[PDB]
Amino acid sequence: MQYKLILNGKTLKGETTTEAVDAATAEKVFKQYANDNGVDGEWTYDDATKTFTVTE
């Protein structure tokens, strides 16, 4: 339920978490957060530790 987002962007680097009951919901939340902060590039997902990595 606790999903982690790794931000590796040119102007924003770090991690942020959300407690979402669904991975697509979690992705949606992270997409909104990253987009709101102007972060894109590439997106990867690992379910082993439930981590979304967004690389810019």
Side-chain angles (χ1 to χ4, degrees):
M1 184 178 180
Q2 176 179 330
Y3 287 84
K4 300 175 295 181
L5 176 71
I6 294 177
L7 292 156
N8 290 333
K10 301 149 180 168
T11 47
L12 288 164
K13 184 182 185 64
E15 187 192 89
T16 186
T17 53
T18 198
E19 299 170 84
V21 68
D22 178 81
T25 305
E27 188 202 292
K28 181 178 181 296
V29 178
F30 291 139
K31 286 287 180 62
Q32 179 62 91
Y33 191 88
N35 286 330
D36 175 72
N37 282 273
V39 177
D40 123 178
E42 182 59 271
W43 284 77
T44 48
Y45 176 54
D46 174 78
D47 188 74
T49 184
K50 288 183 174 300
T51 303
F52 295 83
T53 310
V54 55
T55 306
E56 173 70 73

